[PDB]
């Protein structure tokens, strides 16, 4: 069937799938933040790092994903060019904050697993709070400084028209921004996470497997969600017209979804498990 109505169905069908994602992203992180904020037994260094990730993921399905839903289903932009400039800046700021924090929990956790005596003495709260400031300082620098200041802008006529058009909100970057930002937001944190969980797997070698299944869920769900999108960013930088917007957006949305997983991966502690149910009016 192909009329002028069969389209207004796949739209409502995609439209509710998006509204699940947006809720799952919010619910999971509003629960994780309140858990750490209300329960004392959850005030660990590693948990300060779960928090920074939980605010990064909450802002995804709060300011980015909802507008993402719109722009797509609207099949256009209804917020103007400065709000386009702004929204694009949140998008990058949150993706960098999500991925940096994922790799900061990674180094931290390996340091405590490998050397718990150095960690206990060295990594303070007033050291950890400072790690987090830096995470958001770069996140900001890679997002608001180059997008907002026009340092990201493309030069080809197609983009020049889009940048001028208030109903246009297609992201067009110059060969260098896309590479530089991809290395900062993703590959550096990927490399770090690769060799950090590498030394966890190696120094370790029944109980050995179900715990090693874990760093497999961790490193996996992360790659399975962000490597597709970022390898495509590099391919599209080299060979122009080799990636379809259909594909590029579909790939970004997979990563947008990772933000909903993080609560399920990082908050599996028995104290989280206890905290969550008490808040969900089950315990006590």
């Amino acid at each position, epitope marked *: 069937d192909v009329t002028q109505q069969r389209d207004e169905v796949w739209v409502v069908g995609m439209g509710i799938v998006m509204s699940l994602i947006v809720l799952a992203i919010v619910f999971g992180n509003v629960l994780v933040i309140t858990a750490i904020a209300k329960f004392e037994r959850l005030q660990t260094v590693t948990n300060y790092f779960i928090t920074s990730l939980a605010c990064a993921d909450l802002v995804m399905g709060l300011a980015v994903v909802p507008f993402g839903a719109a722009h797509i289903l609207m099949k256009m932009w209804t917020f103007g060019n400065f709000w386009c400039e702004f929204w694009t800046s949140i998008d990058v700021l949150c993706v960098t904050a999500s991925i940096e924090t994922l790799c900061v929990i990674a180094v931290d956790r390996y340091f405590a697993i490998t050397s718990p*005596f150095k960690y206990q003495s060295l990594l303070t709260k007033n050291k950890a709070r400072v790690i987090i400031l830096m995470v958001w300082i770069v996140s900001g620098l890679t997002s608001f400084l180059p997008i907002q200041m026009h340092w990201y802008r493309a030069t080809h006529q197609e983009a020049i028209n889009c940048y001028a058009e208030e109903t246009c909100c297609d992201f067009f970057t110059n060969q260098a921004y896309a590479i530089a930002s991809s290395i900062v937001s993703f590959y550096v944190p990927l490399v770090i996470m690769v060799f950090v969980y590498s030394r966890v797997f190696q120094e*370790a070698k029944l*109980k050995e497997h179900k715990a090693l299944k*874990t760093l497999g869920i961790i490193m996996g769900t992360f790659t399975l969600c962000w490597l597709p999108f970022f390898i495509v960013n590099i391919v599209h930088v080299i060979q122009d017209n080799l990636i379809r917007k259909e594909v590029y957006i579909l790939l970004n949305w997979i990563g947008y979804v990772n933000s909903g997983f993080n609560p399920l991966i990082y908050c*599996r502690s028995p104290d989280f498990r206890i905290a969550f149910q008490e808040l969900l009016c089950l315990r006590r």
Partner: nanobody
Amino acid sequence: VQLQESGGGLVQAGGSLRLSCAASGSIFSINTMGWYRQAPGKQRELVAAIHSGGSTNYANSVKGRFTISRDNAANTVYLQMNSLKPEDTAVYYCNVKDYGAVLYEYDYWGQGTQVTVSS
């Protein structure tokens, strides 16, 4: 899985003892087995700990005297307490910290081996 402590009991001051603790069961390859002492109606304080890779953390008071070691075959810890002063009289507990699930540490405790250093 349970922690099987022994070596506890009365001993003359300036004496010696060997506290042993067998972690009966499956415990992940990366872990820290240590000793914790409950002073007469006071707070629990770590005596000495040993990581399953090789590194220590003796509580500065027992440093020089008491010496912690471990077997990675059966997973048993030996705090050889020499020159036992009446300040060392406390309930000693066995404890294993368990890394992997790699994000948090599963804490395993023991019932406690009483040590009474008499003068």
